[PDB]
Amino acid sequence: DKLAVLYAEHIATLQQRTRTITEREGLEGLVIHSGQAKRQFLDWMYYPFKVNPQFKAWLPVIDNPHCWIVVDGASKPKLIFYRPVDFWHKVPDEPRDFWAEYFDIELLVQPDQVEKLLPYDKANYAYIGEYLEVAQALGFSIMNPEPVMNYLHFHRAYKTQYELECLRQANRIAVEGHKAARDTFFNGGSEFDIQHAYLMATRQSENEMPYGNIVALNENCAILGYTHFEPTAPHTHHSFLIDAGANFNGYAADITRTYDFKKSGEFSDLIQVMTEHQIALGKALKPGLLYGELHLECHQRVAQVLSDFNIVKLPAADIVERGITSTFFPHGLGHHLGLQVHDMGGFMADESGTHQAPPEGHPFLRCTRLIEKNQVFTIEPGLYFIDSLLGDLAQTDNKQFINWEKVEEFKPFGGIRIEDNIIVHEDSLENMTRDLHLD
Amino acid sequence: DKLAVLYAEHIATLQQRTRTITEREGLEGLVIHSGQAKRQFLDWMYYPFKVNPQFKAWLPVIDNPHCWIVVDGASKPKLIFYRPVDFWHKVPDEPRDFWAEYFDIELLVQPDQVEKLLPYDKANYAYIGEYLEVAQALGFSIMNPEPVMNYLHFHRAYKTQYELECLRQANRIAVEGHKAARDTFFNGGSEFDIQHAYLMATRQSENEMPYGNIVALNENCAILGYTHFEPTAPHTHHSFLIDAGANFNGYAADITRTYDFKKSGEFSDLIQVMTEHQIALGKALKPGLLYGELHLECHQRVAQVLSDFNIVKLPAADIVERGITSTFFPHGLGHHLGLQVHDMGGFMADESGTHQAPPEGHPFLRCTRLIEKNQVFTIEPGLYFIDSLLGDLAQTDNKQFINWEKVEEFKPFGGIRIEDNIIVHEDSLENMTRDLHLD
């Protein structure tokens, strides 16, 4: 209903984007390939299918390989829809959902017979997809041209009302998962149990997740890319960091929360001060501001915490200026969110693809684009006690300034990250995560 | 330590097989590549890693890409082990498992630095792996040579004692899941509930499964390649079919069971009749017998059931000769089981790759090899009510012999498959599945 109505403006937006970039580049149209299933080496089984983001930008068809979109922004969008009729698969119903009527739909019963449906002379058609040797066999010469990709990726940061509603739906699902995971942690669950309570609440399997969930207990919290799920619980429950989202129509949620098992003590205090900073930074998104400036503020807030909690024996400014904050907060403040988890265009200054430079002391900041309305952001400040980086810091002049006893007291708890998904509007902010009352 | 004792003989067998085909094909050795992580098109996320079956044939390292085995059958096997050292990665300590003492281990810190650790002259070295341009760029000319592949695949049918013990462990894990899945079905749970009850009892996540589980309710049991997990339970529970396994050290279980929600009725009797036929088919495994003959016997037995239940109003011999039996049982009786679900060499007559011809009226039969000691088989007779196959039958000159009223009563139950994993010994058969008291 609501989604069906908004979808028309979504097709209109993408039609106008196609017309603009195709005509600017002298192309008669785009051919966007959903992708193919990858077969495993020496085996008959396939890897799980992952749709081309450029394909699902047009319609919520994320589980169908060998599908093709032909668009020029002037004709009605043309869709080749893979629909095999083998007896060992449930034949799917011909496309009858809200997006069907916005396309002229040709059914494809076998992947290799796709050349009849594609354009005969395709010298002025750009193939957008991963399978370049399949494209060359079909007769395409232009493949993923950089001006077309950079244009599309740049305007991906401006979500249509259909996309906004999809991102809201994804946050509603993910938030239900986060609540069930929290409860499982406080009842003494293992990482594996917490993870599968999450999926049971989301009604989405491991491979439907938009990214590999991070479900960490105790010192695993300090491991940023922790992917394992330990099946047996730890003997003592201290902390819990879950980074997990959900999918809706190809769009992603991306939520992180950190919990203290005792819900009191110095680590519990650390979560709450970090929560204050996270809420404040999340309220600092505003059109016309460079995202890197929020990353700057975040480091100052982390330094204030390090100073106030006696983690570093320095006032806040010194901890920022000597670069010690990046030992405890080593990643960017956040990124754009949408069809991809770390969405496209976050580092661009213009639609040609020029990079927007990061701030002076953070050359690895990846999201530096100017904030505008209709853009969706993550805000994920963190403070971690990472053995590896603490080791680096002990080999510097800064070794004298860190309270090594107090850091040993926090190492069992690992670290903290608190992440929301916020829509930036013309004169307001919409925090999708906290409007669903997670906390 | 039981498993570690058997592993020494395993490596002696692998060393000897390597030396045989290596010198027969005039190679100085093999270079077996574990694989790489496949990155998502225009993303930073990756696909779940799946190890090269030839790599894990040597060792139970199934979650590490960029690993290399250099083996010639005479020298101590060399293992280049990928151990990256990054702050966001969990640094695991140097390999200290039961298999480590059997390899000269060199640590690989960055994937592209492997050029130094491989043999300098690669003229007579064969690369076994998927990433052929990576091999060409390292200097390999010999790649997955067919004489080597056919030899190694042929002899994978003869499991070592280490391999038989791993297969028993896989079955034990899977049987626990099958008990949990069954209990959730009788609780009225959804397909999604059952699947995740299975994962939780086995304490393995969806991607650690050796294949995509088939968890089907009611009509979905008739769909042989069903992968969906419906999150909403059906209003009426009639039937449940689950085909699922588990991993142990790279070796797979593969167990199928069918259940009737009421523990009574004609479908319940059909399951029970099919069960006794499945037990008799499984007890017909015998050294010196062609596996195709059991597939013929299976078709004979399914015709018996179709006649006995008045699905087809014909003597069983006339059901077989007229070919009606494939409409209800369209796949093979089973396959070899091991490192891969449908394991290698089940089509071969000799170690050079020569195919063993399938039986008369079954040219697509995949498993045909001569049964011998130390081989592992599945026995999966089936009986299904498949719309598109039943439609084709309704348009043949046998249509008057089919009891369409009874077939219509069976359609909401879908179908039946019962699958066990059986080791063939010299003087006995070891039904791993039924030895675990699953029923």
Ligand SMILES: [Mn+2]
């Ligand atoms: Mn994020």
Ligand SMILES: [Mn+2]
């Ligand atoms: Mn996240």
Ligand SMILES: [Mn+2]
């Ligand atoms: Mn099987």
Ligand SMILES: [Mn+2]
């Ligand atoms: Mn099976």
Ligand code: NA
């Ligand atoms: Na042996």
